[PDB]
Amino acid sequence: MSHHWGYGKHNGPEHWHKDFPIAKGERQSPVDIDTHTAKYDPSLKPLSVSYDQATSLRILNNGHAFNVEFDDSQDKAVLKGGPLDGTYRLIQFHFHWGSLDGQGSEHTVDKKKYAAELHLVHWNTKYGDFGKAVQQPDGLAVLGIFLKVGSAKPGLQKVVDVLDSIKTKGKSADFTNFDPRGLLPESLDYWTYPGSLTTPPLLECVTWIVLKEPISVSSEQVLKFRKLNFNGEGEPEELMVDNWRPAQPLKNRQIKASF
Numbered sequence: 706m707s708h709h710w711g712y713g714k715h716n717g718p719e720h721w722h723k724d725f726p727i728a729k730g731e732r733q734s735p736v737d738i739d740t741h742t743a744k745y746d747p748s749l750k751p752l753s754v755s756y757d758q759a760t761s762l763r764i765l766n767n768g769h770a771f772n773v774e775f776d777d778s779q780d781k782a783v784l785k786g787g788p789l790d791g792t793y794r795l796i797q798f799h800f801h802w803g804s805l806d807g808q809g810s811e812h813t814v815d816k817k818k819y820a821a822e823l824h825l826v827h828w829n830t831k832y833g834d835f836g837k838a839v840q841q842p843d844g845l846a847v848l849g850i851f852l853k854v855g856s857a858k859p860g861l862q863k864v865v866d867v868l869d870s871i872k873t874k875g876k877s878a879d880f881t882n883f884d885p886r887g888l889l890p891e892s893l894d895y896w897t898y899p900g901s902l903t904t905p906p907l908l909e910c911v912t913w914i915v916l917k918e919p920i921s922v923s924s925e926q927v928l929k930f931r932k933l934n935f936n937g938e939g940e941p942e943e944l945m946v947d948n949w950r951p952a953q954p955l956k957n958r959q960i961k962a963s964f
C-alpha cells in the first residue's frame with residue numbers, strides 16, 4: 706500500500722534501487738540477447754506449452770500495465786520442458802510497450818528493441834502457490850514474446866477491444882474464454898537464462914524463456930494500448946506508455962539457445 710515506483714523521470718527504473726536494492730543484483734532482467742554469444746545447447750528440450758484447458762478470468766489495469774488473470778488452482782495451462790524441471794502453471798500475462806513503434810520491449814536482440822513484449826507468467830507447482838514461488842530461485846518461468854508492428858494479430862483483438870472498460874488504474878473487467886494460444890508465434894525456438902522480475906520487487910526467481918520469432922500486431926492494436934492510463938479515475942491523465950525496464954548487466958550469466 707505504500708509503493709510509489711513507476712516509469713516516470715521521478716519514480717522510474719533509475720530510482721527503483723532505493724526501495725528495492727536487489728535492482729543492482731547479480732541476476733537482474735531484462736538483458737540484451739547477443740545472438741552471436743548465445744550458445745546452442747543440444748541438451749535443451751523442446752518447450753511444451755499446454756494451454757488447451759486454460760481458464761482466463763479477468764483483465765485488470767494495475768497502474769503499470771494490464772494483466773489477464775488465469776485460474777491456477779489446477780494444472781489447466783502449463784509450461785514444461787525446455788530448460789525447466791517440473792510443471793509451471795500459468796497465472797497471468799501482460800505486456801510492456803513504448804510510446805513509439807521503435808521501443809517498448811524489455812529484452813533486446815543484438816540491441817534491437819521491439820514495439821512491445823508479452824510475458825506469460827508461470828509458477829513452479831512444487832512451491833504450492835505463486836507467493837511462495839517468487840521466493841525461490843527456480844520459482845517462476847516467464848515466456849517472453851516480442852511484438853513487431855505489421856499485420857494484425859487476430860488472437861489479440863479480444864484484448865484490444867476490452868481496453869475501453871479498464872482505462873484507469875484499479876479498473877477490472879470479466880475476461881473469460883480467452884485462448885492464450887492465439888498470442889504465440891509458429892516456432893517455439895527460444896533463448897533461456899536465469900533472471901528476475903522486471904518490476905519491483907525485482908525478485909531473482911525467474912527462468913526466462915524468450916522466443917526467437919516475434920509476433921506481428923497492427924499499428925492500430927498497439928495504438929490502443931497507448932490510450933490506457935497509469936492514473937486512477939479523477940486524477941491527472943498520464944498515458945500508459947514506455948512501461949519497460951531497460952537492459953541490465955549480464956554479469957556472470959550465459960544465455961543458451963535451443964536452436
Ligand SMILES: NS(=O)(=O)c1ccc(CCNC(=O)NCCc2ccc(S(N)(=O)=O)cc2)cc1
Pocket residue numbers: 762774775776777778796797824826835847901902903904905
Ligand atoms: N488464479 S487467480 O486467483 O485468478 C489470480 C490471483 C492473483 C493474481 C495476481 C498475481 N500477482 C502478480 O502477478 N504479481 C506481479 C508479479 C510479477 C512482476 C513482474 C513480472 S515480469 N515483468 O518480470 O514478467 C511477472 C510477475 C493473478 C491470478
Ligand SMILES: NCCc1ccc(S(N)(=O)=O)cc1
Pocket residue numbers: 708709710711715716717720721722723724725
Ligand atoms: N521521489 C518520489 C517518491 C518515490 C520515488 C521513487 C520510489 S522507488 N525507489 O520505489 O522507485 C519511491 C518513491
Ligand SMILES: [Zn+2]
Pocket residue numbers: 799800801824903
Ligand atoms: Zn513483464
